[PDB]
Amino acid sequence: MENFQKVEKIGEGTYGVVYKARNKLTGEVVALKKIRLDTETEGVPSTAIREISLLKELNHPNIVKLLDVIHTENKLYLVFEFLHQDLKKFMDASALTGIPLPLIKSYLFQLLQGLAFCHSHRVLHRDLKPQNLLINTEGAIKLADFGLARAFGVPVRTYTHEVVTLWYRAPEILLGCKYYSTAVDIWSLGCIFAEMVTRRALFPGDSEIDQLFRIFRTLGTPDEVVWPGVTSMPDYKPSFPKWARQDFSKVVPPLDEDGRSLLSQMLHYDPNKRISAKAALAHPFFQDVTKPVPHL
Amino acid sequence: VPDYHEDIHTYLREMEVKCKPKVGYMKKQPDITNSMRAILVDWLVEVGEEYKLQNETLHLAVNYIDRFLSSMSVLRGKLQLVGTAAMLLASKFEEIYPPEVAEFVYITDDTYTKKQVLRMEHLVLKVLTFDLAAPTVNQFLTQYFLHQQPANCKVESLAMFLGELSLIDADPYLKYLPSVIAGAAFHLALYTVTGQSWPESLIRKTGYTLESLKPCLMDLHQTYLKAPQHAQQSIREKYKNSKYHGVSLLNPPETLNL
Numbered sequence A: 001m002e003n004f005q006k007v008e009k010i011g012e013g014t015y016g017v018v019y020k021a022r023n024k025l026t027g028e029v030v031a032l033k034k035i036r037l038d039t040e041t042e043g044v045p046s047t048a049i050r051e052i053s054l055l056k057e058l059n060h061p062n063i064v065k066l067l068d069v070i071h072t073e074n075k076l077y078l079v080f081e082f083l084h085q086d087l088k089k090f091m092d093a094s095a096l097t098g099i100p101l102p103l104i105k106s107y108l109f110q111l112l113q114g115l116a117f118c119h120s121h122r123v124l125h126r127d128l129k130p131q132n133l134l135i136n137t138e139g140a141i142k143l144a145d146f147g148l149a150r151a152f153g154v155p156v157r158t159y160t161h162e163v164v165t166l167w168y169r170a171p172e173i174l175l176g177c178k179y180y181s182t183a184v185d186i187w188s189l190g191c192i193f194a195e196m197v198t199r200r201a202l203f204p205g206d207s208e209i210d211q212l213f214r215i216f217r218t219l220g221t222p223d224e225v226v227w228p229g230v231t232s233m234p235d236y237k238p239s240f241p242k243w244a245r246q247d248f249s250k251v252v253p254p255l256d257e258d259g260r261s262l263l264s265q266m267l268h269y270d271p272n273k274r275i276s277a278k279a280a281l282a283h284p285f286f287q288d289v290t291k292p293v294p295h296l
Numbered sequence B: 001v002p003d004y005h006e007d008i009h010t011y012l013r014e015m016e017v018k019c020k021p022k023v024g025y026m027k028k029q030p031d032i033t034n035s036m037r038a039i040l041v042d043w044l045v046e047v048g049e050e051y052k053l054q055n056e057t058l059h060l061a062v063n064y065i066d067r068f069l070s071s072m073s074v075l076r077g078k079l080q081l082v083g084t085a086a087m088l089l090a091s092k093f094e095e096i097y098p099p100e101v102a103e104f105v106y107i108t109d110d111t112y113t114k115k116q117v118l119r120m121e122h123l124v125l126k127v128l129t130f131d132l133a134a135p136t137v138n139q140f141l142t143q144y145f146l147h148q149q150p151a152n153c154k155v156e157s158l159a160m161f162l163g164e165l166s167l168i169d170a171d172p173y174l175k176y177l178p179s180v181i182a183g184a185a186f187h188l189a190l191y192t193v194t195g196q197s198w199p200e201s202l203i204r205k206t207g208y209t210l211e212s213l214k215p216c217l218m219d220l221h222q223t224y225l226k227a228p229q230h231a232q233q234s235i236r237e238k239y240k241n242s243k244y245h246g247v248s249l250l251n252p253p254e255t256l257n258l
């Protein structure tokens, strides 16, 4: 553990502190997750078992690279490639002008590729949110934080319900469905897509029911026509207020017809109808995609 | 049919070759033997039942065990310990509510301390270099089941049963990849129940002909005939329950005709 000079706290993760650090010997800049063991209760958290073991499989340029695991007596450190900052801080710093459209298109393309690789390697990320997306100076964005990820089966079976950060959580999880798969990650990306366009979180609720209503109020309250089976889901209530679906050019004004189309496909109530990461890359919204450099 | 079915399958075929224990590992183990491993795995079954764990966890455990023993010498008194930290790491990886460490201490009848299981957990991790997302006979079985005309549940449970027998006997089964054993278990179930054979769709999907599955069928057939005489019976007793449609009570076919 002694080749590293820690520079500062950079982040919190869902399961441990992250630092910027440098290799005294190679000069290499890195990020260090500290995962706290404290020894005699439960040992190494399932959280870390999953993250390390999935991340080792998931080598792709749109996924953070795990360089090393320092597996001490008292602590576990995951050593990652250092990336300049998160999409979150990038968005906050771009609130008044907004991120250039060609940059959004690029970030979305790149993210979709990262997600495609994940899903094709049987992994759900389950915590796609802007402070988990990492951006460098050369125009790249990478999925990070796999502490909440898992390997899914074909077919799936019931997974953990306490899943995905509220603002980004898909309706099928909100409404208490038995089964969810890859579509939960697409929904999250949809919200993120929208956030880059509007500079405001799309569905910023403060409780499960508040979240539900924020989705309903924008996309229309779901019914059997739009989502066969909604009305018989465990946490569906006939007493949910019935709001009309708002027009996309009001929801997400700066988008052209192609962006709206793609967004509407990512944000479909029916997980079975929701577009896949792989199919999305074929979307005509990406016919003219480039690699712009972020105005840091 | 799910969105990434073909893709995931191709990928598991790449991974099953990387997640391999060396075949003749038991030959270089000074103190433990195949029949001991057999006692161990059998026990792990008993444990999965008691704690209502997924069959996939059992399979992950066995894979960790075979990989760990492939590179560490283990004395008989420590064998259970390796299996216990395997099972515990399989649980943590694959289950929603893994049992707690105190529950793993408990079913060793207090042979080992909590302090130990946690140290063994650490070591097992160290030895497998944190590589736990291993393909199992089980993953391929489910994947194969989707190509079923139509969904016979008896065939399913029986294939699951046959694949689970494969876990107990390192000789011969370590010879085979999970996909191959899966293929074998599937055709053998299908036949036994309905007379039908390993279908055209899977031949296209896996590249596997009845002819390439033959050596494994030959062995798996044997195992299946000798199943009630076998020293370890935990699987037979498990697959007697209604949950599994009592498939372990069906009569194997006399010949496989191939």
Ligand SMILES: N=C1NC(=O)/C(=C/c2ccc(-c3ccc(S(N)(=O)=O)cc3)o2)S1
Pocket (backbone or CB within 6 Å): A010, A011, A012, A013, A014, A018, A031, A064, A080, A081, A082, A083, A084, A085, A086, A089, A132, A134, A144, A145, A146
């Ligand atoms: N939750 C996480 N999971 C990871 O793998 C992480 C690795 C990582 C690399 C770089 C960063 C990183 C995170 C946040 C910033 S920030 N607060 O925008 O300056 C800057 C860099 O995190 S963070």
